Every structure is written in structure tokens, then in C-alpha cells.
């Protein structure tokens, strides 16, 4: 699917995070439940590119190539991935040579050092790749159906407020940047506060208030 991104309210309904609250027609949030949801969104620890999903691997390679000023290695990857998205199975393997050549470059090593999760490493690769050129989402539209999470994560790079579906890794990525080090302990509280704020802006119907537990 290409379903639209969930709003705060939809996300909160989708994961059972709404709770009665003892401001009319308002709900509260299940903090501990929301914490688990946002922790599940962080995804795996980075532990070598080799262990990333193919598409994370390939996109990493593209942004790595951008960081080391190799616009052509990058565009070659994006070109083949486009071509093969039409054919109906992408050839992520085209990324292996660029990876091999830049994974240990100085600039990439600095990024991998600072972030603990696949999603936060690749977010920072993309951010860094953007100091070369523009590298918009639209050059990798094909990602949305492969890795919905990754697509949303990469679409939040440059932005202020993430989609709820990636609020967890967005908040952690920001925390890692603020702390100056990688962090394996999830730092997702910010996603909780934002979910609370958003849910308290939306009025429910009496049916929806009545359907709610404490």
C-alpha cells in the first residue's frame, strides 16, 4: 500500500494508546504503552552495514557516496534502483561497490560513531549527504512500499515535527545529536510528550469518549 501517514489521533487509536482522563471531549495517553510503541519503532541497532536491510544498505551507500563527493556513484545507484523498480524487483546489489569503497571513509565513520540505530545512522547519512546537494525523497519514491518506516524516517530529515509512525526514532536521533554520543538506551520521551499534546488538541465524539477505558 501507499496509505497516507497516520495523524497523531489515528496512530494513537491504531495502537490502543487512548485512555480516559479524570479540554472536554479529550483523551489522555497510555505513557508506558506509548513508550513501547515508540521503542518498537526504533528498529535495530546498527551493527555493520552488512546487517542492514537491503534498502537501508543501498540508500546508505548513496548518501555515503554523496558525502565523499561522488555524485556519480550515487546517481548510478539511484538510476538502477529506479529502472528496476519498474521491472518489479530492485537490484540493491548495485550498492555493494559504493559501500565497500566508502563505509570506512572518515566522514561515514564519524556518523556511525554518533548513532546507535540503523534509522539514526542513515538519517544522519542523509543529513550529511545534503551538504553536497539536494537529495530529495522523490529520487527514492520506490522506498515507500518496501520500508514504510524508513521512508517516513528519511522524509523527516530536514523537518521539525515527524510523522507519528517514526516519532520514536526521530526523537532518539535528535537526542543522540543533543547528547553528542550514540545511545543504545532509547531516548523517546519527546515522542511521548508530543503525542500527548497532539491528542489533547482533538475532540472526540461522545461515542468515542464512551468507548474508552482508564
List residues near its own copies by CB under 8 A.
1-5, 79, 82-83, 85-89, 136-138, 141-142, 144-146, 155
Pair 21, 37: CB distance under 8 Å: no
- Is the Cβ of residue 82 or residue 189 nearer to its own copies in the bound state? 82
Beta carbon of residue 198, minimum distance to its own copies (angstroms, whole number): 17
DSSP 204: P
- Is the Cβ of residue 124 or residue 155 nearer to its own copies in the bound state? 155
Closest CA to 94 of 54, 47, 145, 150: 54
Q: φ, ψ for residue 165 (rounded to 5)? A: -60, -15
- Is the Cβ of residue 32 or residue 145 nearer to its own copies in the bound state? 145
Q: φ, ψ for residue 77 (rounded to 5)? A: -65, -50
Pair 124, 114: CB distance under 8 Å: yes
CA dihedral for 20, 26, 28, 34, sign (positive or negative): positive
Pair 27, 210: CB distance under 8 Å: no
- Is the Cβ of residue 53 or residue 208 nearer to its own copies in the bound state? 53
What's the grid cell of residue 12? 494513537
- Is the Cβ of residue 156 or residue 188 nearer to its own copies in the bound state? 156
- Is the Cβ of residue 22 or residue 87 nearer to its own copies in the bound state? 87
Q: Which residues of 46-69 are buried (b: 16+ CB within 10 A; e: fewer)?
A: beebeebeebbbbbbbbbbbbbbe
Beta carbon of residue 2, minimum distance to its own copies (angstroms, whole number): 5
Beta carbon of residue 130, minimum distance to its own copies (angstroms, whole number): 16
Beta carbon of residue 1, minimum distance to its own copies (angstroms, whole number): 5
Beta carbon of residue 82, minimum distance to its own copies (angstroms, whole number): 4
Beta carbon of residue 109, minimum distance to its own copies (angstroms, whole number): 31
In three-state secondary structure terms, 117 is: strand
Amino acid at each position: 500500500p501507499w496509505a497516507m501517514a497516520l495523524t497523531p489521533m489515528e496512530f494513537a487509536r491504531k495502537y490502543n494508546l487512548l485512555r480516559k482522563d479524570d479540554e472536554e471531549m479529550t483523551a489522555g495517553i497510555r505513557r508506558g504503552d506509548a513508550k513501547r510503541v515508540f521503542t518498537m519503532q526504533l528498529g535495530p541497532y546498527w551493527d555493520g552495514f552488512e546487517r542492514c536491510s537491503p534498502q537501508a544498505y543501498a540508500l546508505s551507500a548513496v548518501f555515503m557516496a554523496r558525502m565523499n563527493r561522488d555524485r556519480d556513484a550515487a546517481n548510478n545507484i539511484l538510476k538502477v534502483l529506479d529502472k528496476t523498480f519498474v521491472d518489479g524487483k530492485p537490484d540493491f546489489s548495485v550498492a555493494r561497490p559504493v559501500m565497500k569503497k566508502y563505509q570506512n571513509s572518515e566522514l561515514v565513520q564519524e556518523v556511525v560513531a554518533k548513532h546507535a540505530y540503523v534509522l539514526t545512522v542513515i538519517a544522519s547519512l542523509l543529513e550529511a549527504a545534503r551538504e553536497d546537494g539536494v537529495v530529495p525523497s522523490s529520487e527514492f519514491l520506490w522506498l515507500k512500499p518496501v520500508d514504510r518506516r524508513l521512508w517516513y524516517m528519511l522524509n523527516c530529515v530536514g523537518r521539525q515535527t515527524p510523522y507519528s509512525e517514526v516519532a520514536g526514532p526521530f526523537a532518539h536521533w535528535k537526542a543522540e545529536k543533543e547528547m553528542g554520543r550514540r545511545s543504545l538506551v532509547p531516548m523517546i520521551d519527546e515522542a511521548i510528550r508530543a503525542l500527548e499534546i497532539a491528542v489533547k488538541e482533538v475532540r472526540l465524539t461522545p461515542r468515542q469518549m464512551e468507548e474508552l477505558e482508564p
